[PDB]
């Protein structure tokens with residue numbers, strides 16, 4: 001139920017460390033290693 005979305009090519013920011021990125025894929029690939037979480041189980 002989205003409505004009134006103002007997105008695009010605006011600056012990016014990681015929700016784990018707070019690093020800035022210029023490329024979209026960069027933020028995604030970063031989230032992979034950027035976990036900061038130990039061995040978790042089901």
Ligand SMILES: [Zn+2]
Nearest residue numbers: 014016017034
């Ligand atoms: Zn990060």
